[PDB]
UniProtKB/Swiss-Prot annotation:
Native organism: Streptantibioticus cattleyicolor (strain ATCC 35852 / DSM 46488 / JCM 4925 / NBRC 14057 / NRRL 8057) (Streptomyces cattleya)
Pathway per the UniProt entry: Amino-acid metabolism; Antibiotic biosynthesis
GO biological process, one term: antibiotic biosynthetic process
EC number of the protein: 6.3.2.-
NCBIfam families attached to this UniProt entry: PAGG_GluLig_BesA
Enzyme class, broadest EC rank: ligase
Function summary: Involved in the biosynthesis of terminal alkyne-containing amino acids such as L-beta-ethynylserine, that are produced as antibiotics by S.cattleya. Catalyzes the ATP-dependent ligation of L-propargylglycine to L-glutamate to form the dipeptide L-gamma-glutamyl-L-propargylglycine. Is selective for L-propargylglycine over norvaline, allylglycine and the standard proteinogenic amino acids, except L-cysteine which can be used as a substrate to a lesser extent.
Pfam families: ATP-grasp_3, PGM1_C, PreAtp-grasp
Protein name: L-propargylglycine--L-glutamate ligase
Sample GO molecular function, one term: ATP binding
Record's catalysed reaction(s): L-propargylglycine + L-glutamate + ATP = L-gamma-glutamyl-L-propargylglycine + ADP + phosphate + H(+)
Keywords carried by this UniProt record: Amino-acid biosynthesis, Antibiotic biosynthesis, ATP-binding, Ligase, Nucleotide-binding, Plasmid
Length: 458
């Protein structure tokens, strides 16, 4: 007997939730986990800031996970969908916590079963609290540890230990502007049209590209002040300063010529067993990761895998259980350098789950997914937001459109298109789409077709 409780709240996004609006519908991502209901024992609870739409659920059941009609009723019986009483735009976990009754219910559910697991994006105070107060152990909670080691500096240190190539820099916090300046002027330079330095605020709260601040050294050498020579600062200066004071930053060289930005995804079992889950080729694309592709490029896939494994081992030693992410850059002829470490699930993870479900099989060998017949599988995954055109659709409508023009993934052919986060369609005009084909080009084409279908009238 298992009980699993799904709260895929984006907690590390304190600002973005109040900006990018389709975020409230983020939790829907968790619907990739329904595969678990294949075990007669597993019981799932889904929590979203906004109610999952019956249509979406139906799609997932039939056209995604391909449940046989006999068992389907049973599967449905072992699934519950719940919404916090708060409809304020805040991290989902927090909202859940605030609803005492909901928490109580969750606890009761957990008790009812042998085993409790909480399924989350990043480990957070709120998630930890929930775990404590419900008797479910977060699958990816461990807040203090995360704080310690998912930080920029910590990540860098881990990378170094692993023997994974990092960009030239220290792994040392810089609690003052002077320190930062010193760090900047003590670097690797290297021939660069516009030689640059980058200061990355150490906290994990600042994940991705809000913390990272970039200064061209020329400007500095003339004017002593950090925020006088900032070529890219996305923080209110004052706030940045405060962060520096209180949490600080770490100093890394800005690699100029970037061709690809691959990603590596790792899982530690509780017995330390590290698994290379997958490798993709993310495309920062303004950092909003408007998507990604699988598998990674043939050249650096194998290389990446080994690196990931090493990192995983290191993390296990350190004592991290759950899931880790390594973000990379490819720097002209200089090669491949690990830039980020993430102590949390990452975008690709959820996509990968869905992909696996579609295929019917797990990632495969040590790398590269393959269908029943053994033939390789390639997917393209994109976030698309078009208030204008998509805001006209509802989940059901979209699904039927996909079915009509034979765009929807069919299991008999082994190629097509599956959507995610369908609830955002009507409300924010947002959707994820993933496209699977026999060749990557084919997959891309399919994706394009889908886009065309959905972002036009009819
Ligand atoms: N050193 C670096 N140069 C350029 N972009 C980066 N993103 C993260 N680290 C970077």
């Amino acid at each position: 007997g298992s009980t699993k409780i799904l709260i895929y709240a984006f907690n590390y996004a304190d600002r973005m939730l109040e900006e990018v609006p389709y975020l409230r519908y983020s939790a829907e991502r968790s619907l990739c986990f329904l595969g678990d209901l294949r075990d007669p024992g597993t019981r799932l609870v889904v929590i979203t800031s906004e109610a999952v739409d019956p249509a979406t659920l139906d799609y997932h059941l039939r056209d995604v996970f391909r449940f046989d009609e006999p068992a389907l009723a049973d599967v449905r019986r072992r699934l519950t969908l719940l919404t916090p009483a708060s409809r304020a735009a805040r991290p989902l976990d927090s909202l859940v916590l605030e609803d005492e009754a909901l928490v109580e219910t969750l606890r009761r559910a957990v008790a009812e079963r042998p085993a409790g697991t909480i399924v989350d994006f990043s480990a957070s105070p709120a998630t930890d609290e929930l775990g404590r107060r419900t008797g479910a152990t977060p699958e990816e909670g461990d807040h203090a540890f995360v704080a310690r080691w998912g930080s920029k500096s910590g990540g860098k240190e881990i990378c170094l230990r692993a023997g994974v190539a990092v960009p030239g820099g220290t792994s040392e916090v810089l609690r003052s502007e002077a320190e930062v300046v010193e760090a900047i002027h003590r670097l690797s330079c290297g021939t660069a049209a516009a030689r640059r330095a980058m200061v990355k605020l150490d906290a994990i709260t600042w994940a991705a590209s809000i913390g990272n601040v970039l200064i061209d050294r020329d400007k500095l050498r003339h004017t002593g002040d950090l925020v006088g020579s900032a070529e890219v600062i996305r923080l209110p200066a004052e706030e940045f300063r405060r962060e520096l004071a209180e949490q600080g930053a770490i100093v890394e060289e800005f690699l100029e010529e970037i061709t690809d930005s691959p990603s590596g995804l790792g899982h530690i079992e509780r017995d330390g067993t590290v698994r290379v889950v997958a490798c993709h080729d993310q495309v920062l694309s303004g950092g909003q990761y408007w998507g990604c592709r699988f598998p990674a490029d043939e050249r650096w896939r194998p290389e990446i895998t080994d690196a990931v494994r090493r990192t995983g081992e290191v993390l296990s030693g350190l004592g991290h259980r759950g899931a880790f992410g390594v973000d990379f850059v490819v720097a002209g002829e200089r090669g491949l350098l690990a830039v980020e470490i993430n102590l949390r699930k990452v975008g690709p993870s959820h996509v990968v789950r869905y992909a696996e479900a579609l295929v019917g099989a797990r990632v495969g060998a040590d790398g590269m997914l393959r269908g029943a017949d053994g033939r390789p599988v390639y997917y393209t995954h994109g976030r698309l937001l078009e208030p204008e055109t998509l805001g006209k659709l509802n989940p059901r409508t979209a699904v039927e459109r996909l079915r009509a023009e034979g765009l929807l993934y069919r299991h008999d052919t082994g190629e097509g298109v599956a959507l995610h986060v369908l609830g955002a369609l009507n409300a924010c005009g947002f959707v994820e789409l993933t496209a699977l084909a026999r060749s990557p080009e084919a997959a891309d084409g399919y994706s394009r077709a889908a886009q065309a279908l959905l972002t036009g009238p009819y």
